[PDB]
Amino acid sequence: MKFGIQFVPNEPIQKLCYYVKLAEDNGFEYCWITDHYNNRNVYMALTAIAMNTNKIKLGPGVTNPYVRSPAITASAIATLDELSGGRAVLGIGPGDKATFDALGIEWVKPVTTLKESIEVIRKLLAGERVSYEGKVVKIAGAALAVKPIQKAVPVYMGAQGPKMLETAGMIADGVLINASNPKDFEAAIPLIKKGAEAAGRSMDEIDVAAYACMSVDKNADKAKQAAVPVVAFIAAGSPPVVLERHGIDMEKVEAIRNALKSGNFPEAFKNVDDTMLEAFSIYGTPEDVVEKCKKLAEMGVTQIVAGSPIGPNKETAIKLIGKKVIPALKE
Amino acid sequence: MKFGIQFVPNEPIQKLCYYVKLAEDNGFEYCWITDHYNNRNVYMALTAIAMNTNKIKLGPGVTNPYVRSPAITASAIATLDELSGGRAVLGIGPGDKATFDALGIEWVKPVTTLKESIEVIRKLLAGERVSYEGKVVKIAGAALAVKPIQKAVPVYMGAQGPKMLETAGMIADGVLINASNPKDFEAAIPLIKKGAEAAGRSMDEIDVAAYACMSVDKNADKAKQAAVPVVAFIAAGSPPVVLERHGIDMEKVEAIRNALKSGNFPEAFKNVDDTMLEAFSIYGTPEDVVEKCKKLAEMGVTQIVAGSPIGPNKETAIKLIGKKVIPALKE
């Protein structure tokens, strides 16, 4: 099994570089840095990370077609791939409406735009002069001078709905699924397979990645507590098909949703229960986490991304995962 | 007088970092890195440059409102300012039509968009939750988490026309003028002053910067030759008011324009003459260059940006400028 790690670049980039280099030392193979306008720029963060790392794969996790021209994304990826000696991955997803309303960006046809942007980025990265007259992306003779080192930089697609999952199956080298429980991938993976089948692609060409909320501790209950704030948000933003799939107490969810609107948090955090924790996080001892990763592996997950909080102390957790989780999951 | 240096990031970023650190060692105070989708990403280049430098000011030279959301630009600048210990400048201009047709980007109202984007970036950098309902830029509750170190990161506006010059006078901390000859600034500076006056601003608040084609050599004629390719492009793209202002042989210009369309270059380069060289470059011995810089200083230029080619050998020229040009122009 492959392990990724995901960071929001919301701290001094030096601290981020320490965490990633630590992750690299601990056998993490993918480094995913989120891309939101209000934090440190994802590509500058990834530049510093590249300089402090040597082998971990690294890229935006995820960027989107809208906040920069896909052509800019292409050459940012090319640049990253040059600096890192060929370790770049492109995680790219739809973005979100609450970002694009804030930025005055029209959220046009997200499936179509993501598909067309991935195709344009790929062609640009391949060195082509691109003429692409899509429904949304319209490129007329663009060409990169900067070249990646990889022949084909991997493109990971953020995918939640069925059309996105199928599209990821047809076009993407990996699928980034914000989900921590096997039930989600039991539903998700056949959709990826339909898209793969539609393109004649084997599933072994496709890295199904769990963008999981993870919290590992030598003490299971402290792992629990660090998971609680993050599960509260995940549970609030989960679509009802995901709540229903997991039998989530729907009354607790709306009290959490309410208290989040109310800007107060301990009450929202008080209503996360053991069921939502099981559905939206991988928490507990390294033993707890290892069994849970195996259940995801058995469901077809090939990359598990340790997302926030990682653990009560991120440094302590990265070390624990490297010592006692990743070695327990070597094919 | 202040000296800047401008680089296209079209080489391995390590080489760029050497040049900038060399420039810094040689007393250059500003480092301007161009922002075009087809080269190395400007902000990743500036991240590495920051890590290899300590005191030179550095920023995009220039970015634009269109290839990334102004909000992304704001946090890229904030990020740069954090990494560099407060040395960021934002050079921002309109972009160009031949880039945005290639990218399918509508080149909407460039003066208005540049003005509104500068205002939004400033407010974002200041830490505000921004609601900005402009004619073009429409921001609704955006806010940065990343903070600059500078209280007010300097915004330099690329400006060529009279409306841009006046707008730069009203709003910008510097004006980036792609021009090498005093006649251009004799025309340009009163326009900046009109805008400054319209805002109650003194000219001593405004860094009038010559984005010059510079070529310095111990041998004047070799400096000449290295200037010839770059002047050929500048002369082809110059507006007729600039050709007319300089009495440029208009027949030579169209042969250069023709041969550039024809994709062949020695014939285009053969038709650069001593008049276009004088109008669109600062070339020659360090003595030649120093007198020419003084004539620009006397016209109101407060920053001279050594643009390509810098000299026949960029490393040799940066050293010559630091040894024999910059010290000869210390107020």
Author numbering:
A (entry chain A), B (entry chain A): 1 to 331
Structure paper excerpt:
Mutational analysis of four functional amino acids, which are similarly positioned in the three reductase structures, indicated despite the insignificant sequence identity, a common catalytic mechanism with a 5‐iminium cation of methylene‐tetrahydropterin as intermediate protonated by a shared glutamate. Based on mutational and kinetic analysis, evidence has been provided that all three methylene‐tetrahydropterin reductases have the same fold, similar methylene‐tetrahydropterin binding positions, and the same basic catalytic mechanism; however, the binding modes of the C1 carriers and reductants significantly deviate.
Glu6 at the C‐terminal end of β1 points towards the deaza‐isoalloxazine and pterin rings. Position A contains a glutamate residue in all three reductases. Neither variant showed a significant increase in the apparent K m for their respective C1 carrier, suggesting that glutamate and glutamine bind in a related manner. In addition, we obtained the crystal structures of the inactive variants jMer_E6Q, and hMfr_E9Q to exclude perturbations of the active sites. Based on the mutational analysis at position A, it was possible to extend the proposed model of the catalytic mechanism of MTHFR (Trimmer et al., 2001) not only to Mfr (Gehl et al., 2023) but also to Mer. The mechanism is initiated by the protonation of the C1 carrier to activate this molecule, followed by a hydride transfer from the hydride donor to the activated C1 unit. As the methylene group in methylene‐H4F and methylene‐H4MPT is chemically a rather unreactive aminal, it is unlikely that a hydride can be directly transferred. Therefore, the formation of a positively charged 5‐iminium cation is crucial for catalysis.
